[PDB]
């Protein structure tokens, strides 16, 4: 959605949430348990 349009309206510069997309997607693989648990916090705060 951010992109394909080419016609649309502004957003208050703090509404674009740049980093939401990363913690939606899977954790990937490598990361040590610190960052995975960081993900779970970001979900829990989102869903809520």
């Amino acid at each position: 959605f951010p992109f394909n349009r080419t016609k649309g309206k502004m957003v208050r510069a703090q509404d674009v949430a740049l980093a939401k997309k990363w913690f939606l997607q899977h954790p990937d693989e490598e990361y040590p348990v610190k960052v995975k648990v960081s993900y779970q916090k970001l979900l829990k705060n989102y869903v809520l």
Binding site: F3, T6, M10, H26, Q40, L43, K44, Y46, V47
Partner: protein
């Protein structure tokens, strides 16, 4: 033409530009175009995740929401003499087809089933690999 005016609302752009933007922002973008990817990562599999008190393995954990499960009669219906274990029933069943595997849900939602199994095929190597090209992923017909 490009933008509205000093009050600066309703930007109006053009393909070549919006391309170049696409190009740049490549570090910062979600990049995944197949809805069928998020399978249990949509919302509703989260809400189901909570409300039944499960945890998708990569999932956010929440609170019981219906905390006291401990009340129970000693009751023959679901018992062991009468039940056959063939396949385990992992959770993701219970989050995938909620009303079925899970006796007695409360406040559950509708998982959305599935999408078309995207075929999308992109050619990202060459700038000059032309638009329409028979791509080795395809079968020969």
């Amino acid at each position: 033409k490009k933008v509205n005016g000093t009050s600066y609302k309703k930007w109006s752009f053009d393909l070549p530009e919006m391309s170049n933007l696409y190009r740049l922002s490549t570090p910062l973008r979600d990049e995944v175009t197949d809805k069928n990817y998020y399978y249990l990562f949509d919302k509703k599999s989260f809400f189901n995740g909570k409300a039944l008190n499960n945890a998708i393995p990569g999932g956010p954990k929440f609170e019981p929401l219906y905390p006291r499960e401990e009340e129970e009669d000693y009751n023959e219906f679901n018992s062991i003499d009468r039940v056959i274990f063939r396949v385990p029933i992992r959770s993701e069943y219970k989050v995938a087809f909620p009303h079925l595997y899970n006796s007695r849900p409360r406040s559950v939602r509708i998982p959305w089933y599935n999408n078309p199994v995207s075929c999308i095929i992109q050619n990202d190597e060459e700038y000059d690999t032309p638009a329409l090209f028979f791509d080795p992923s395809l079968n020969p017909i």
